[PDB]
UniProtKB/Swiss-Prot annotation, chain B:
Localization, UniProt: Secreted; Bacterial flagellum
Lineage, opening ranks: Bacteria, Pseudomonadati, Pseudomonadota, Gammaproteobacteria, Vibrionales
Subunit record text: Heteromer of multiple flagellin subunits including FlaA, FlaB, FlaC, FlaD and FlaE.
Biological role stated in the UniProt entry: Flagellin is the subunit protein which polymerizes to form the filaments of bacterial flagella. FlaD is not essential for flagellar synthesis and motility.
Protein name according to UniProt: Flagellin D
Gene (UniProt): flaD
Entry superkingdom: Bacteria
The family this protein is said to belong to: Belongs to the bacterial flagellin family.
Boundaries of the shown chain within the full protein: 325 to 377 of 377
Misc. remarks from the entry: V.cholerae is able to differentially regulate the flagellins within the flagellum maybe to produce flagella which are particularly suited for motility within a given environment.
């Protein structure tokens, strides 16, 4: 262990979890504005097919 | 024949007020939901700004 200036691993961890939280926030906002849980097949493929057929 | 023709024309052309009012209310609530979502989303660059410094 050492105290460095070139690398900030804690900063990388914070950035990774920040991007994860931002992606979750955008997904939730899209689902809330659209009013549909399934807005693409990546949300649910079989769910998308069933909803489309219904 | 005129009575039956008027009935058929009402079935095709005349609107269903209950279904239309339900659709209008649903559209209104959807508009308010998109309003709230857009107002919340207009603030992410503020989170970007608070990180700068």
């Amino acid at each position: 262990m050492a105290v460095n200036v070139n690398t900030n691993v804690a900063a990388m961890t914070a950035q990774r979890y920040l991007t994860g939280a931002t992606n979750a926030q955008q997904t939730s906002m899209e689902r809330l504005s659209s009013g549909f849980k399934i807005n693409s097949a990546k949300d649910d493929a079989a769910g998308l097919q069933i909803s489309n057929r219904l | 024949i005129n009575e039956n023709v008027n009935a058929s024309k009402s079935r095709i052309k005349d609107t269903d007020f209950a279904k239309e009012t339900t659709a209008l209310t649903k559209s209104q609530i959807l508009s308010q939901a998109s309003s709230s979502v857009l107002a919340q989303a207009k603030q992410a660059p503020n989170a970007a700004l608070s990180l700068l410094g």
